[PDB]
Amino acid sequence: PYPPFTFSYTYPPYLRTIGKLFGLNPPLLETAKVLDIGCGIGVNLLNFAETYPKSQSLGVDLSKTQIELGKKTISDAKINNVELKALSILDLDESYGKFDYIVCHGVYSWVSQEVQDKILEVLNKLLNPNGIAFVSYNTLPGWNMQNTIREMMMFHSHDKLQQARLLLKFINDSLGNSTTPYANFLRDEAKLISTYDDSYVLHEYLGEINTGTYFHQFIEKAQKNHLNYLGDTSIAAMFIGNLPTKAASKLQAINDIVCTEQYMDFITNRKFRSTLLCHQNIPINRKIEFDNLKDFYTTFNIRPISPENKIDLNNEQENISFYYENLPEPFISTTSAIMKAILYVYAENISNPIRLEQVAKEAFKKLGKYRLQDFLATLEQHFITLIFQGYLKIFETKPHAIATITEKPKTSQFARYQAKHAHFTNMFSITNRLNDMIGIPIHEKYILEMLDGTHNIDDIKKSIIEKINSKLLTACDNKGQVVTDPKLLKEFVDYVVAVSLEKFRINYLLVG
Amino acid sequence: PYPPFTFSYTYPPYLRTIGKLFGLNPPLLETAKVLDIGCGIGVNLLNFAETYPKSQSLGVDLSKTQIELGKKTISDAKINNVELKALSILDLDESYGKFDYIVCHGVYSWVSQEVQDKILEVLNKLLNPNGIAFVSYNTLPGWNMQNTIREMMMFHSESFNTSHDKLQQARLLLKFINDSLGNSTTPYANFLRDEAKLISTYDDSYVLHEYLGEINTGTYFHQFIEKAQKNHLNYLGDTSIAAMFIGNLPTKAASKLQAINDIVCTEQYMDFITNRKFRSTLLCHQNIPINRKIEFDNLKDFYTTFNIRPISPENKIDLNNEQENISFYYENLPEPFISTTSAIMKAILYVYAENISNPIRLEQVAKEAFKKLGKYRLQDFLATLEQHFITLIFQGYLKIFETKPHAIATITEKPKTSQFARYQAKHAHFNNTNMFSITNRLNDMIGIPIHEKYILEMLDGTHNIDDIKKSIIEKINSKLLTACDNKGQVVTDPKLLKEFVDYVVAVSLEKFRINYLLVG
Ligand SMILES: Nc1ncnc2c1ncn2[C@@H]1O[C@H](CSCC[C@H](N)C(=O)O)[C@@H](O)[C@H]1O
């Protein structure tokens, strides 16, 4: 029927990180009042409203259906905090109130110019002064290609109508040689929609016609509306320097954000953007001074090849390798015993953010060798670059979740409610404490929904033993075959319970 | 001031060739009445109106300035055939009569939809039934990129600076782009690198016009043909033969394409996968069936030219030897082209080289190739032309004509050019950019260096070859502004500079020979 969706980058505790990063002063979370335009179902604000019981929230949408259905999901989870109303963006006065965080996900490209400027204008009168605005949209020249591909598909219809995919199986097969004038391109654009899902293609490329806009046209429409450009929720975008050094110099030399960004859209073929705005009074500082960056809880997710126990750190002739999120290849390596000492603690601390100084402290106590400020030196010198490349995540304040197993694990009422409604093809989607959406198998949903903090690690093991022994769950053990037996299923359910609880650990799914 | 530009693909003797290719019967050239919308200065109608003195014609434009200037340039050339008028396309109706050929070149994309469709219906009411229409426009999705590239320039020409103003920082933006793309990036921007770098080419006039001056808009083809069929017009084809031809795609795709047997689809998708920037399309009254079946029986009535120079001169090479492999050349590129083996191919090609830039009927190619070596029958010489040639004429490597043009392939010992081409060399468009631009008898524009511009204005038929060599020696040994070709000298000796001016003037006369610049 309708997708439930939630995004890490629309989370108020995130926008507050972007704000407190650039020298702004976003409002207080606990009392924060958030507003969502084009709320839809509204599952986007829910997890927030559960984390900060004192934070009121108001969503709006034009569809009466979505509003009512969402109101059901909101009532059934016992979430009294949020409020949803069915209206058109053109009715705002103000009232109702000013909000500390506003979020508009893409409705911007899908609606008329009249409502278009009207969005910015509500973001003028409905935004408390230190608050933060979020608007997502499509940008040129990335909109050109996708648009034309919707034209090509749109020009032949022989009925499916998914025969459009028989167009692309055509294109990649068609074309052929013509080595690389333009032909190496458009291969990527065709081949790259064969991914996503049958829903995406039909949504974007069929619609509901949407229109792209230009950076300078958007934030030029944000100006004159008395708003300014704070940044982008994707850090790895706003960062430059992958281009040759010569050009980089001449870029920074002009020192105008709108120029460097608008120009960065052309060389990347930038399709979308999620942009945050703020009132044009407050000055912004894009100088990153480490002394203000030591206050940010960070997470670098890496695991090493060798355990600390079996290795020594002070060794030089040895070079050890970590790994990032996936993969090999290993990413970085050392050699330098000041590097190992830190990275290893960025491993032990996986999925429990820690203050940046505390990385030097903990990396110090781990190995007493040198002073502390030298650990802070190597941390300042090349790390920050890694946090602007997206490999290090920053948070203020810490999210509410834990990196340890509580011996009677407990999750959010939300994730435990999500574990009721399937919307099942790969696996289930569940929202962790960061508003991000996690995949999860069926048995992990059966282990998950059962943690309210009442049951110890065994109680679930039992309830799984039945479900496997009885109908619902089944399982097999290698090589293929199995369907098991009374005792051997037991330890299988033990292993599968330890892995599932660890995944729930490092994914920010453990509230207590 | 304004562009003095002329294009081979707008020539009535050309549009009539594409018409008589597709089985139409365009009107008569001698009496032809041609009309040009947005003529500007109007230099496009002239070299026709002078070559066929009985052909009247009228250009029109909105700019009174341009119109008056053209009214001047025609007088200085003493051309009584053309006429220029200042009008809006909305006032053109029917009072100026019906025309056998109409040309609208690069307006349709620069003007409002109202004047836009007004163009098409105007092409309905003033076009003699069998006449032919020409319209050029920018198209998608090839116009998109180039547009965005005009966006960057239209943006960073404010902040990025130094200096004064438009085209300069525009070029510093191009060289900037290429600098900002190193080998550090090859996902996509190989495409944008090639497309931007491609703009470091063309001309300061082009760049200043297209990517700088007023807003132009592309269209989708099928929306164009769909706005023509709505105006009671039909799609004849394109003035670029090498365009309408498919087959570079694998057979699997090719066949599945041709099967549908609907032209407008087969073309449009060729706009999608080739990224077609512009189009020059000719239309006609529907009313008249057109046939895209190309019968060899209708193509032997076309004068053809294959432009070639041999690697091996005929004197020193045998013909019937089947162990020897020849190469030749195509036009000015320094790449060997074709090879054989079959001595009927040597026999033919060698007569296609002798006749370079001298069109001859395909039959006459078979005859001359027969007299070249008596061996086999004649119908086989017509055969080897049938098997693989026509493919080459659809790839643009063989040029076709109806009514072979007015020009000469030989040096008359007192060379002479058109009173037009001898006029153009008195004025711009400079400079030795590269060289001067001159209009041959085919409406094509040949660059010529300064010294060749000094010889070309000096052939009225009054001066012999030696009179040429003398006046060039003077211009050097005198107030000068000299230039040279290869070796290394450039300089002063009399006995050297004599034989040097002999060579340079003979080469210059050959270039005018094969370029259709010799009317006698
Ligand atoms: N004029 C209008 N007033 C209020 N909502 C509108 C609107 N026009 C469109 N919308 C809403 O904007 C939504 C865009 S789809 C966005 C879904 C949701 N924001 C998410 O992705 O999580 C649609 O559901 C539509 O109902």
Ligand SMILES: Nc1ncnc2c1ncn2[C@@H]1O[C@H](CSCC[C@H](N)C(=O)O)[C@@H](O)[C@H]1O
């Ligand atoms: N409404 C109008 N009526 C008549 N001419 C117009 C017009 N609008 C634009 N034009 C003319 O169309 C011309 C397009 S520039 C084309 C120049 C010329 N056809 C060539 O290729 O060499 C301009 O010179 C402009 O004067």
